[PDB]
């Protein structure tokens, strides 16, 4: 007295993975903005979902997409292959003050021209970290014996553009709308969307710049809290602004090294030689560290002493705060911020150095050379997160030291894709019903 | 309700908004071009692999189409009150997940016998 009825369009979904495409609204850019398509949220009731931010597949796909997009604009323009010559570098002095002598050098070298059997003796200005000496003293480039140096492309821009990794038809994206969500566990407030919000691909270590803020309190995220080898992500509830600037003019000079091959170097500086620096507010940082430690004391106890120290040592792109402002890469010491001990109008100025040979994405064999920027560089930025770590103690004291760390670019993008999940819709169903054909 | 709005309701309360989910299943060689092309190819293939299974059983253009096979008591011994008013769609597909292949096999030969029985009806 029962029969089979086939239903098409039942709300049943499985867990799967697919490929996502860009979607943005619209001098070129590094990331393809004009190649994306031009750009609803349905709340669900009586359904739960177990989210896990440490086993997501969107982070690796986003990392592979950013790597594939970074190596597509450096190809068709000029590479600086004959630059590995014997330089002759001296010191530069033009009303220069203290603590700057030794960071800039005036180099002179021979270089080929558009004719094959002729030479030309030219000169330029280089930094301290870009040249090394060999045994007037002779100098050479640092990334010459291990990597090939190509110039950064002068018709692109490194400005971050918010994009939307958006799923095709047949799949769906779920989002947990919890205000105190920690990326792991069940979520009783799940809503479906088309795709995500604007995510800016900001490349920075130890400081989450131009990110997303929280809603209620400062969030602390970690995978294994009993291990001293996992990073700790801190999400603030308020932004802390910071103003970075460089007082140098940095005029540019073009040299033709061959047929249709140009090389942009530093010319002459008109003015004083001062340090590039970032000013950060001192009154907001104290209450920011207080609101961080008030949430951090819940995972270790109410009888814990919290020490904030600087980095120990390693690579220059790990211990120092590395970021990009105005097209120029800055490396700040930032040792004056993480210096505190918490027991149960002024501004801090951090000097930053500038490097022209940048090795991105921890690669050994692919280098770059950024061109000089004309004018004065000054930018503002927000601080909406931190990447910290701790060391292994002797499990008998109550003192915990937290040091800034980074280097891995997956942690900078896992803080934005920690609430989204991709599901696959299956609309077929079979039901019992007392009905017959014809 | 919207797209997937009746996901938490019962099986009797979610069988009336089936047209909402049935209409959202179809819609230089750079990095963002091949991904869009593969996404369109995957969407077309996922639409065709369901339209073919809908067309084999004889439900071309119908969503609550009726069949002629009987329901065996060994698959589910529940009545009409504990299915359309208590269980949802996320649990009913997991309840008879071991018996879907024999139902999909029985839905083919009965349609074939019904199509070959119609040939002996207009030949009089």
């Amino acid at each position: 007295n029962l029969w089979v009825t086939v239903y098409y369009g039942v709300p049943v979904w499985k867990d799967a993975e697919t490929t996502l495409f860009c979607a943005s609204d619209a001098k070129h850019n590094v990331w393809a903005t004009h190649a994306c398509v031009p750009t609803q949220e349905i709340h669900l009731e009586n359904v739960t979902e177990e989210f896990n931010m440490w086993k997501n597949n969107m982070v690796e796909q986003m990392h592979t997409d950013i790597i594939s997009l970074w190596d597509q604009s450096l190809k068709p323009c000029v590479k600086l292959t004959p630059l590995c010559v014997t330089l002759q570098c001296t010191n530069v002095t033009n009303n220069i003050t203290d603590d700057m002598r030794g960071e800039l050098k005036n180099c002179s070298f021979n270089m080929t021209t558009e004719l094959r059997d002729k030479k030309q003796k030219v000169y330029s200005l280089f930094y301290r970290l870009d040249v090394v000496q060999i045994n007037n003293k002779e100098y050479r480039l640092i990334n010459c014996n291990t990597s090939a140096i190509t110039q950064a492309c002068p018709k692109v821009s490194f400005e971050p553009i918010p994009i939307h990794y958006c799923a095709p038809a047949g799949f769906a994206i779920l989002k947990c709308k919890d205000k105190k969500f920690n990326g792991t566990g069940p979520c009783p407030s799940v809503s479906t969307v088309q795709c995500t919000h604007g995510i800016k691909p900001v490349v920075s270590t130890q400081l989450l710049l131009n990110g997303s803020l929280a809603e209620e309190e400062v969030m602390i995220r970690s995978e294994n809290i009993t291990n001293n080898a996992k990073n700790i992500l801190v999400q603030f509830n308020t932004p802390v602004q910071i103003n970075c600037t460089r007082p140098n003019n940095n005029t540019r000079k073009s040299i033709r090294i061959g047929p249709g091959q140009a090389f942009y170097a530093t010319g002459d500086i008109i003015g004083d030689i001062r340090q590039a620096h970032c000013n950060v507010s001192k009154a907001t940082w104290n209450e920011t560290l207080g609101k961080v430690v008030k949430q951090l004391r819940k995972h270790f106890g109410n009888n814990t002493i919290i020490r904030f120290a600087n980095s120990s040592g390693g690579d220059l792109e790990v211990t120092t705060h590395s970021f990009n402002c105005g097209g120029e890469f800055f490396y700040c010491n930032t040792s004056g911020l993480f210096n505190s001990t918490w027991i149960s109008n002024d501004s801090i100025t951090l000097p930053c150095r500038i490097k022209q040979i940048i090795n991105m994405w921890q690669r050994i064999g692919q280098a770059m050379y950024a061109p000089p920027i004309q004018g004065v560089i000054r930018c503002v930025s927000n601080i909406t997160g931190l990447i910290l770590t701790r060391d292994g103690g002797s499990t008998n004291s109550t003192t915990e030291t937290f040091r800034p760390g980074g280097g891995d670019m997956r942690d900078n993008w896992r803080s934005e894709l920690y609430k989204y999940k991709v599901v696959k819709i299956e609309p077929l169903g079979v039901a019992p019903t007392r009905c017959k054909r014809r | 309700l919207g797209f997937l709005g009746a996901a938490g309701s019962t099986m009797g309360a979610a069988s009336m908004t089936l047209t909402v989910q049935a209409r959202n299943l179809l819609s230089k060689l750079t990095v963002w071009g091949i991904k869009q092309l593969q996404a369109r190819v995957l969407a077309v293939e996922r639409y065709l692999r369901d339209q073919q299974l809908l067309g084999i059983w004889g439900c071309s253009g119908k969503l609550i189409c009726c069949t002629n096979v009987p329901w065996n008591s060994s698959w589910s011994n529940r009545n009409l009150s504990e299915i359309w008013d208590n269980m949802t769609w996320l649990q009913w597909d997991k309840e008879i997940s071991n018996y879907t292949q024999i139902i999909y096999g029985l839905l083919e030969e009965s349609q074939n016998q019904q199509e070959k029985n119609e040939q002996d009806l207009l030949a009089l």
């Epitope: 499985k14 867990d15 739960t48 177990e50 896990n52 792991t184 566990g185 069940p186 995978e223 | 060994s74 698959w75 589910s76 011994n77 996320l90 649990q91 997991k94 309840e95 008879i96 997940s97 071991n98």
Partner: antibody, heavy 132, light 108 residues
Framework: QIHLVQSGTEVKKPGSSVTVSCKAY?????????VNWVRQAPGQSLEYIGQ??????????HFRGRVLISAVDLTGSSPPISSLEIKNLTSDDTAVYFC??????????????????????WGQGTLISVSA | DIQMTQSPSTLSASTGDTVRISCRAS???????VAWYQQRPGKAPRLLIY???ALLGGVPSRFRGSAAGTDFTLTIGNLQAEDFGTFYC?????????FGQGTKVEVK
């Protein structure tokens, strides 16, 4: 892998209470898992006592209002702890108690059916012998 | 409340035979919500088979399980010297769960 330890053999007098602890090593979060507590009488069959799921602890219809199950999350200097307290025990509670976990992450895993589930990982069991 | 009955109570076999253990429930479990556990005397219990006819990671392929209406059977072929213990059939369809009765396999 996932290793679980429990308490030792505790001898208790009738009239007082008892508390059995269970420490885990390897699990991530109790929101993705479920901790079930059963027992086993010597020379008899097993018996299901209680369970904690989605931060919702419950017991059976025979041990209602008698036992109490509690659990906490991760701590940077402490393992995951699941405790069970028995108050007003009788002279028929000498048994080997256990502590089981079951991963309830995947919906189509087939190891759980709407709250009641199987036992994928077992412990060592504590002997509780009560006498006057 | 479904009461499980295991068969047989106490049997014996040798190295190389096949042991068939049956389990009969009270109602008709049409969803295959049954599991087979093994417990050594003195040691900890170990889950062998979940969902009637599915193996676990680390269980050899010599064990087999089948389900038909009320009757859930378990076949153990190529019997070794380390498979002597107690076997349990436990359902988890209705609340609460109930174990079987115990089946010891000796050696003779």
């Amino acid at each position: 892998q996932i290793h679980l330890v429990q308490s030792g053999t505790e001898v208790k007098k009738p009239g007082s209470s008892v508390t059995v602890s269970c420490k885990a090593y390897g699990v991530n979060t109790f929101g993705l898992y479920a901790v079930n507590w059963v027992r086993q009488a010597p020379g008899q069959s097993l018996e299901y006592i209680g369970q904690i799921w989605r931060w919702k602890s419950s017991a059976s219809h025979h041990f209602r209002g008698r036992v109490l199950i509690s659990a906490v999350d991760l701590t940077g200097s402490s393992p995951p702890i699941s405790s069970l307290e028995i108050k007003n025990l009788t002279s028929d509670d000498t048994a080997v108690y256990f502590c089981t976990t079951t991963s309830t992450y995947d919906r189509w895993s087939g190891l759980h059916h709407d709250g009641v589930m199987a036992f994928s990982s077992w412990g060592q069991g504590t002997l509780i012998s009560v006498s006057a | 409340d479904i009461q499980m009955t295991q068969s047989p109570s106490t049997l014996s076999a040798s190295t190389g035979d096949t042991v068939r253990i049956s389990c009969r429930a009270s109602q008709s479990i049409t969803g295959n919500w049954v599991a087979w556990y093994q417990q050594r005397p003195g040691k900890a219990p170990r889950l062998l088979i979940y969902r009637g006819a599915a193996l676990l990671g680390g269980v050899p392929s010599r064990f087999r399980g089948s389900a038909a209406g009320t009757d859930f059977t378990l076949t153990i072929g190529n019997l070794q010297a380390e498979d002597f213990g107690t076997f349990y059939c436990q359902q988890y369809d209705t609340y609460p769960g109930t174990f079987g009765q115990g089946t010891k396999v000796e050696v003779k």
